[PDB]
Symmetry: D2
Subunit: 475 residues, 4 copies
């Protein structure tokens, strides 16, 4: 098992308080990993600093080939990466083998292409006798923090564009899911020059905080919850660091009277619950039109109750557990408060789903209002709420009356309603007659309280570069 922090030339174990990496299926310990010391953080940033000298001066072709190699490396060990990510997070193995790894590998490969393909306004004489041109240069040293929900994927989202942009990076995985990142570190170490990627581990309160507050770091990119985005943003206020923030969502799913209701029910069954709802695009806040509302609640209830989790044979599991006990408790807590509200019904699930480990019952919350906490607040759990709306009600406006703005979907056979919703929804993403489907060419990222900056697509790479104007006078 790979246990060591990558710092410049060398691998070394932690020096600080150990963290208890648990297997969330059963609650048992996998390994104990010591956090990086402040000194260890300092040397990582330093190795990133001295590596930026050479790395920022590389050609796009040089950087692109590096990324292709990284992709080849992950591809070779795809099965091992999967199993190790299935252990760390208790994700069903086949969902990881089939869904995550190939997207991950495809991502490294997308960015190999994107690197050699940036555009800008054309070079020429905008002023007489002066030739202007636009470049995109590196920014500096990037401090990157990933969450626990898709460890290895998040790493790809954070590393590839920043490295591709000619930056150097100090990366910290979530305190509970450092495993795939340390295995990756090893392969990366063989491919990149020393210090272009450095990987430290530890708790956010201590290791995260020191990284985002380190004076040498010019950009900080985080994916997590709002609380932490605010901390990052407050820390940036000190030295005017660039920020890249993806802070979660509460994806509205507008279901009109004329939707293919069978496909809707199947869409929410998969995409409301995948990764036990620990996905920031989860199909979780549903708006059902008056006519189909009762039909939907029942049909979905029936569908959700059949979702398989925690079986002995992992190939038969559709859903894994929540990452930790604190996280399950947080989910249990949200639901309990909702079930307390007299106008709400819990039609299936609603309780803890596990003797050991951190499973929760796939849950359906019916009859929730725009005013309910369950509708206003990210639950990040296998939980879906349903809200009814009238013909007299603007379901798009209801959907836009939110703090979140990451992703959304609309279901209808109708063209007029599909297109009008798609033009008016205030969301980074809007799917029509599906949900959740990502592709590495297309940008992921929100507005409002979901934050700013993209992941995937050429825009991710534009976020990690600086536009520069060069103007030569013809004397």
């Amino acid at each position: 098992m790979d246990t060591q922090l990558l710092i410049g030339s060398r691998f070394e174990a932690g020096t600080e308080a150990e963290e208890h990496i648990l297997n969330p299926r059963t609650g048992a310990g996998i390994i104990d990993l010591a956090e990086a010391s402040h000194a260890q953080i300092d040397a990582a940033v330093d190795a990133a600093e001295r590596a930026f000298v050479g790395w920022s001066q590389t050609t796009p072709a040089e950087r692109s080939n590096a990324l292709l190699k990284i992709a080849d490396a992950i591809e070779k060990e795809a099965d091992e990466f999967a199993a190790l990510e299935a252990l760390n997070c208790g994700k069903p193995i086949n969902a990881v083998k089939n869904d995550e790894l190939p997207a991950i590998i495809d991502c490294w490969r997308f960015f190999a292409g994107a690197v050699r393909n940036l555009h800008a306004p054309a070079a020429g004489e905008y002023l007489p006798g002066h030739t202007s041109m636009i470049r995109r240069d590196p920014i500096g040293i990037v401090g990157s923090i990933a969450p626990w929900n898709y460890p290895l994927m998040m790493m790809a989202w954070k590393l590839a564009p920043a490295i591709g942009g000619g930056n150097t990076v100090v990366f910290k995985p979530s305190e509970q899911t450092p495993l795939t990142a340390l295995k990756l570190a090893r392969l990366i170490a063989d491919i990149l020059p020393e210090g272009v990627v450095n990987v430290i581990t530890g708790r956010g309160e201590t290791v995260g905080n020191a990284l985002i507050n380190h004076p040498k770091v010019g950009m900080v990119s985080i994916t997590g919850d709002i609380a932490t985005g605010k901390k990052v943003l407050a820390a940036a206020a000190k030295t005017v660091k660039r920020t890249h923030l993806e802070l979660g969502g509460k994806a509205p799913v507008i279901v009109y009277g004329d939707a293919d209701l069978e496909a809707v029910v199947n869409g929410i069954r998969t995409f409301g619950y995948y990764n036990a709802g620990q996905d920031c695009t989860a199909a979780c806040r549903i708006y059902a039109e008056a006519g189909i509302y009762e039909k939907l609640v029942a049909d979905l209830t029936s569908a959700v109750s059949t979702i398989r989790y925690n079986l002995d044979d992992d190939t038969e599991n559709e859903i894994g557990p929540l990452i930790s006990r604190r996280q399950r408790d947080r989910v249990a807590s949200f639901v309990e408060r909702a079930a307390d509200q007299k106008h709400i019904e819990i039609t299936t699930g609603g309780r803890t789903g596990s003797d050991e480990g951190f499973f929760f019952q796939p849950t359906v919350v019916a009859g929730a209002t725009q005013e309910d906490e369950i509708v206003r607040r990210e639950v990040f759990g296998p939980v879906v709420s349903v809200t009814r709306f009238t013909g007299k009600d603007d379901a798009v406006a209801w959907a836009n009356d939110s703090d979140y703005g990451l992703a959304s979907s609309v279901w209808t056979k109708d063209i007029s309603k599909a297109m009008r919703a798609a033009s008016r929804l205030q969301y980074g993403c809007t799917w029509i007659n599906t949900h959740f489907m990502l592709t590495n060419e297309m940008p992921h990222g929100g507005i409002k309280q979901s934050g700013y900056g993209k992941d995937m697509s050429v825009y991710a790479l534009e976020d990690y570069t600086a536009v520069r104007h060069i103007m030569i006078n013809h004397g």
Copy 2:
């Protein structure tokens, strides 16, 4: 007699709070007293912005483009009067405003009208089988924008045109000392845009500015000012995850190699070190000069700087105006004094006040300055240029990059090789070769590090004000 009222929705309204004394900074005389926005007027402006967003955000690129074309026309129709108003308010020499500023302002509005209809994105298509994807660029929401005082009207163009053109609505505040051209423009805009798309409030940063940037309904804040104010805006936005667009000043390095056309360098710095009395983010103010040429450069610049004319009765004959206020002069003076206190440093010309009335400081050259010197390390924002020597075992590029700032820069050399190497390595939003200062509305302006991020002018300013959206349609 003059444009004095705030623009709040469909209401023109005098502020109801504390008055500001807007001074003719040539004479120190009071031009006018302007009551600032009350808290409730701040609220009404944001509320008009919110109401206007509904319609305005659903306009087409052609409608917004045509609106922007009209503002330019309106400005153009009143170029004489805008220029005369800004000259009075800021003390800028009238012909400088007429020939340099107004044509660039009008061009800006016109540029963005074109940019509005010309946004690109990855092509639409099936990236996943049976799913058509396409990318849009939609409005973000309500912008609070704050302008500084060095170019009141041009800053407004930069702040407004790309925000409006993105289909955003705006609450705009000019700086406390220079609200006049903004109030004037607000009158003309009211007759062109639907009400509530653009709203204009006046007041102090600590009061009106602070309420504007902390308003829950404001989704993005854009400011051009100093580093302290940026750190303020970032601290506010931390409370609600507001998007930010920050231009925080610079200390433009000017690398002069030995094989430089030394005359051209002198003439450049004479203009671009001192234009607008050095009250310009991109001022040619931190000169690095190779050992071979240092001494000659120091003397020729010294002599050239000393002939810069100002505070003449015939405004035609003035090349720069005064600093904006007493406090700014006093601050510039102190930088000069502290630097002159240094044994290795020589003030070769100027370095003293340039008028009894008003706020002129003398064009100053500070020679013998070292990389450790405050005068090299920190932004002066007055008519002051420092010269540092570099030797052959020194890396002028490294030296220039060793800075908290990253907005603009120039390199001077007859040698295409050294130029291109310099240009490629400089950690500066912009690098001129064998000139300085020259702007064109198609080209982005904006810095790195503590200079901030985001661009003004170019298509990029407009990309900073729109949200990228992925739409995916499942066929089957």
Copy 3:
């Protein structure tokens, strides 16, 4: 009385050669006899374009942009008069020209004024170590430009603005039947652009057009016409390897599925199959109709198409005009007669000429035409629409794609799925869904296959008239 003279550099001139009889197409009466440009005059136009290129190719995007804005402004000042002159010349109903064409023309000039300033390319930078590359889009040369008779003034815009905008100079020829607005515009342009940048000559394809296409100083030829002229231009270009820009006709397929809003479909075709008397490269003319609704659609279409007003004294009451010439009407009539010859084909309304005076044809519905029929295979360019049935066995899209044409199409259904799938697979420069005919200046119009290639409107038009260049500078 009327603008009569050719623009040849700094000079307005009567044409030296034989005269065209410019006819009023709704009465058949003569409007004016106009002398063609002689060969020496074609030489002088092109020489003046060569001299103008020296300067013009070297102007800034901003300069060219300001110039296109001023032309937009000029056409706008005289909009009514342009409309009336176009109406008279072309038989178009006065209010269609006034409300549809003029605003679109003006906006085309304004659109390109922006596009001129917003070209992108790959970013500059070091793709090879020590080498700084950049991409420019430079002018191509002298453009020989030829317009068809369908929309004289709009085609001018589509041809002049991107070409001039790209920094090319131009020698433009309207169609022999419709030079009138082109010459009125020529005077206006002459007061804005440096002499020789735009040149306007008049005359026939086989004489003046030929002499222009073949001139060894012309580096690019842009034509909008029929497949026949396109082949002629292509062959002419072959001998000198000229760049070509060709829009050569379309036979727009209209797929109507069982779940279409038939009311909308019928009103769409009533308007778009017949606008400008069907003298439109994009006319809704080849309908494919699912068996379930085929019957109703034919009957409902017949009824609406029979109410179409034309040839009335109240020109505000007219919906469509006449064909351009007797030649064109007779060509249309021969198409309709041959279609009427087939046993399986039924003409439900119209089918004969529609005036005693002038060149009107009766709006025509042709029912039961199949895939191998001439009325489906070939462009009629008359107020004539065929309807063809497909069953569930049939792949309506495969049918549509089985064509030499590739310009425009539409698909009508309330089902999002079927609509997107059609849009993905249609082999046509443009596909409208649940509408037709709608153009917008930011969006490109242009065919594949035998409709030619290259674009009008959008930045792609402007890309067509520029040469991409790679500059690479060695640092070492």
Copy 4:
């Protein structure tokens, strides 16, 4: 033995028709006799392409991109033997192929994998109220591609990658003398792509090329060759309005100013005037030298060019190889002999045949040549460079621009000012400064004027192989 079979759809198939005598151009001895494709096999290859297009045009960028990456892997796995095969077939010095060509070929497949997923267009949105437009870049159809013999394997990469990348299907013909690497690569590709996406046929331009370019199903023709072949390809396409993609040679001007670095100029011209025996479309062949340095340059170049090594047994030691064929060697010799008969021209070195055996021509310097001379005006495509004196009353840029060709060019000067002015005014697809010849896969290659249009390498080649489509959806 080797790979000799043609690739038609699923089947590998021997050529049935007249044999081509494939020679080793170093010795003039036969390598293999290869029978050409019959009319039937040509027809079968086009038909396979037609079938394969139904699926392949419907694939995602991701799957096409993956396919390109795999083709790259396969070439890389067999880098050395492709190197050996090309060195033998073409006479290229082994190390040059191994180190220059193979790297660039592999990189070329990998760059297009990228490009395939990174196409941009104008952003989707509502440009007309209530209508959502988006732009797609869709495949064109079946591509007929013809490569020359100067870089068999590289040309194939340029022809296939953007073609297949854009989702088109291909019938491809290598040059008659040089099919060996294409037939090898053909077997690797059949293991990677779906059946019929790529088809390889062999034979002469006059038979096989002619039939390929005339086939009614081929929608686009791409050729790199001489101007003569471009003209007739154009004539063919004229009949049927096929898209063309023409790269038709160069005569690259090399402007050497007085303040140039003459060691670097001489070293540049030594390599790039003569690399691949001057059989390169970008060869630095047409030199313009300023009066002040004209005599030193001629002398220094002459002596640099006389030390060029070729025709040695130790191939590692050879710097250039022979011409492809006896016809080519003789074509160059007559170019040189006709230059020699000019009394004003001086042949400073070579000018004669360069081997008993094989098709070597001696590296040649032609001094004293004029703007009026054949040797200046026409592409020689041999190891031959011409030098032409210019004065201060002469505009070297204007002189360079007075040519039928427009592919590539360089300028040599240490002066910033002269380089940028030359780069901005030169009428060439490409301008290097203080280097020549260097290519990079992100950066477009392709000419203007009689060099033809359309690009190789870069996202532009991929644009050339796709159709821009406007899709507009009505919300009503």
